[PDB]
């Protein structure tokens, strides 16, 4: 689970915060990335921590 600004970092040849410290994809990556919004399940009115 990531934020909305960090979905573009899940890509081959990409850098950033998530791509350098959390999850790095290879440059010769062959595969499929799926992302969907989860504001109804992974969020709380007091703030999901």
């Amino acid at each position: 689970v990531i934020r909305g600004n960090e979905v573009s970092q899940i890509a081959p040849g990409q850098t950033g915060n998530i791509a350098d410290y959390n999850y790095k994809l290879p440059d010769d990556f062959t595969g499929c990335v799926i992302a969907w919004n989860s504001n109804k399940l992974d969020s709380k009115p007091s703030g999901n921590y």
């Binding site: 909305g4 600004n5 979905v7 573009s8 990409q14 850098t15 950033g16 915060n17």
Partner: protein, 50 residues
């Protein structure tokens, strides 16, 4: 029709804090890439708001 131009000069530009300021999806650029802007550097920056 009355968009605001702001000149940005004589400062250190950090582009990783723009994502925290506004809730957008993509940092869509044309001549450069969004992930490399902390490495190269320019003369003057211009901000147009509308």
């Amino acid at each position: 029709y009355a968009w605001n131009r702001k000149r940005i000069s004589n400062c250190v530009a950090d582009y990783s804090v723009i994502y925290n300021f506004a809730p957008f999806f993509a940092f869509k650029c044309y001549g450069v890439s969004p992930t490399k802007l902390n490495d190269l550097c320019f003369t003057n920056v211009y901000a147009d708001s509308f």
